[PDB]
Design a binder for this molecule. Structure first.
Ligand SMILES: CNS(=O)(=O)c1cc2c(N[C@H](c3ccc4c(c3)S(=O)(=O)CCC4)C(C)C)ncnc2[nH]1
Length: 169
């Protein structure tokens, strides 16, 4: 079965959300696209990026290093398409702004705009966690920007409940 997402709550006609680990979702659903919360040099050193790379037994990092050698780094708000390995057909590496490192929160709209080149995506909440953006604001930018079908996996029941309550106000 293709893009077999289960147990999501539909927020809008094209945005769905689940309290789930994106790694486990990717292994079970086998989506056409999984989004990585990347940095500009595609160094998957921790957080969501480190977990997705570890689930590929480091194949994503080796492929990423070869992409950067030939193409140079990404820009904040930009993306590239690489292999999905065992997690998806493709991985869309998207760089959201890291507010904790002084990058502009306005680039979060440009980051979500990359999703619109793909019909269906499994994604994390961009710039949340240690990237420092307000997660309620990241969900609002996602809903306002993405026009294709996005399935957000947020691996924290406390944050999931706060996001659904924020959306339903
Ligand atoms: C890394 N540990 S894990 O168990 O594999 C995992 C964490 C995680 C996860 N965590 C959320 C999250 C969302 C975005 C970003 C991060 C974190 S970050 O801190 O890695 C910086 C990059 C942007 C968190 C808010 C609840 N969301 C979805 N599947 C996940 N899987």
């Amino acid at each position: 079965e293709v893009n077999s997402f289960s147990g999501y709550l539909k927020l809008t006609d094209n945005v769905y959300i689940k309290n789930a680990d994106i790694v486990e979702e990717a292994k079970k659903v086998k989506p056409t696209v999984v989004v990585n919360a990347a940095n500009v040099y595609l160094k998957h050193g921790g957080g969501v990026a480190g977990a997705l790379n570890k689930a590929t037994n480091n194949a994503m990092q080796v492929e990423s290093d070869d992409y950067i050698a030939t193409n140079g780094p990404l820009k904040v708000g930009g993306s590239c398409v690489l292999s999905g390995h065992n997690l998806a057909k493709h991985c869309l590496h998207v760089v959201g702004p890291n507010v904790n490192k002084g990058e502009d929160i306005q680039l979060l709209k440009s980051a979500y705009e990359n999703f619109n080149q793909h019909e269906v995506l499994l994604a994390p909440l961009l710039s949340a966690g240690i990237f420092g953006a307000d997660p309620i604001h990241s969900l609002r930018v996602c809903v306002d920007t993405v026009r294709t079908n996005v399935y957000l996996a947020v691996f924290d029941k406390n944050l999931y409940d706060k996001l659904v309550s924020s959306f339903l106000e």
